[PDB]
Write a protein that binds this ligand. Structure first.
Ligand SMILES: [Zn+2]
Ligand SMILES: [Zn+2]
Lengths: 306, 306
């Protein structure tokens, strides 16, 4: 038993991280097959980032202006092309460590693991959620750009995020692996603001089920409620509204614990109005929303990967 | 910027995990060179665990009673020997993926990463501290035994923990890689109790420095204090007492932020007496103690590994 903020094992992804340099800028890229993916702002200087014209900037770069290093090995760049906000560098050698992989664009509220890298070298791994305003609350220093977020489904790695920038508010923004930003952000150093960061209600509920599985039941209450009455309270507290799809997602957890989704909703409601009162749930004094219903099931049943 | 509970990349350790079976019991082992390390209670049944006589039980087992599987590959057991609470299985084949490694016995308050495995297969990775009562608050299901905890120092993997059991209180206990338990626990299914779980004061202080680095300064106060007066308050709240060694550890963080260790201590004191008052520090409403001063430095400067 017990419950921990768990990340996916990162071995499959460590073998895909390379160091990409263009001019005097160095960041991380992702080496899959004979293509290296990296943030297109690798071709910018600190001054260019204020108002970059990436098309004009890229015209003055040739295949030999890009240095790709796989550890202490040199990859030869034989072709380049810009797709949205990523560069695609075609190299001469296919990565012998390419795993079964796919690209996916995730929805807000989904979770993934981030492998934070510097100079193509892994530094650490952590789990996070995509916030409803399409930012992530990460841990990134200079040179981490091109670090990637991923999920694992048995033997297949689903890449879903590449880090591109830190906003002036200290939160983080990036793209899918096709180069389309999550949210309305652009790869320019300018005052950009994110919308309201709401709590992911369906994830809070999954976590409350995990607490019950692990023996934290004090918050369970004798009331019940309806979807409408609950959503009207939730919205007052900047919680995402719950839909019937979210009720379907929580079905298996409802069956294991014997607690109806709507009964759990009525417990959460009382918590939103009356606070924790100094108590904790699974060692937390705040309501956690970085576990999805799938994550809870995965951890409480012991899924593995190869 | 930002701050996250970060684990070490686990690629180097995923390649060392094997599945060990003896009779009708299956758990994880660690395959390094031509030796497999695993919990000795692999040779027990559910009934044996009540009052095992491991010497007598091991006499009735031969080298061919042990099944070692490296993925879908069979390792031949050519020698076995019990060292404290681990079995050492000498196999015919050396692991081609053995990294530079060492064994270390950590002290309470140190942190490490756990690679949770089931049937020799990685499931996830998380960071935790060794509590002052030599337990860990982990996430382990049946079959996770033999999962390992580790640190990474550039290219060398320091193995420091192997999971052996869950206590009736839901916390977890295990050994170093020589087979000596942390704490006074034994590998028997009996009412075993841990002592008082105190907070790791030196780690709380490191985390408060991290908060200041990242722009959370509200808790900073105008008071100061002495080591003695602070320790007398700490002990009332079941905090570990601070020593001059802990002050030396925090020296570099004190220099970066311009805040004397003792001034930070006086802030913490006020927090212990007057509570958070509903505020948060680095997104937490509780005082975190699972970052060591080294971890904070590592994350706030961007150390990497190969
Ligand atoms: Zn950047
Ligand atoms: Zn066991």
């Amino acid at each position: 038993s017990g419950f921990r903020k768990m990340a996916f094992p990162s071995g499959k992804v460590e073998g895909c991280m390379v160091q990409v340099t263009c001019g005097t800028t160095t960041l991380n890229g992702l080496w899959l097959d004979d293509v290296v993916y990296c943030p297109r702002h690798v071709i910018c200087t600190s001054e260019d980032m204020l108002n970059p014209n990436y098309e004009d900037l890229l015209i003055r770069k040739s295949n030999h202006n890009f240095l790709v290093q796989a550890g202490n090995v040199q990859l030869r760049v034989i072709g380049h092309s810009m797709q949205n906000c990523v560069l695609k560098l075609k190299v001469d050698t296919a990565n012998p460590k390419t795993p079964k992989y796919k690209f996916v664009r995730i929805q807000p509220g989904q979770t993934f693991s981030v492998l934070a890298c510097y100079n193509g070298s892994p530094s650490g791994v952590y789990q996070c959620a995509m916030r409803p305003n399409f930012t992530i609350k990460g841990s990134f220093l200079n040179g981490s750009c091109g670090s990637v977020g991923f999920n694992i489904d048995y033997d297949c790695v689903s890449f879903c995020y590449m880090h591109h920038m830190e906003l002036p508010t200290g939160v983080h923004a990036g793209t899918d692996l096709e180069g389309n930003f999550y949210g309305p952000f652009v790869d320019r150093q300018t005052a950009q603001a994110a919308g309201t960061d709401t709590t992911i209600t369906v994830n809070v509920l999954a976590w409350l089920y995990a607490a019950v599985i692990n023996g934290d039941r004090w918050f369970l209450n004798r009331f019940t409620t309806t979807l409408n009455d609950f959503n009207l309270v939730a919205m007052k507290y900047n919680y995402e509204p719950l839909t019937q799809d979210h009720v379907d997602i929580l079905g298996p957890l409802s069956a294991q614990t014997g607690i109806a989704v709507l009964d759990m909703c009525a417990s959460l409601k009382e918590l939103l109005q009356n606070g924790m009162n100094g108590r904790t749930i699974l060692g937390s004094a705040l309501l956690e929303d970085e576990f999805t219903p799938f994550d809870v099931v995965r951890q409480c049943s012991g899924v593995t990967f190869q």
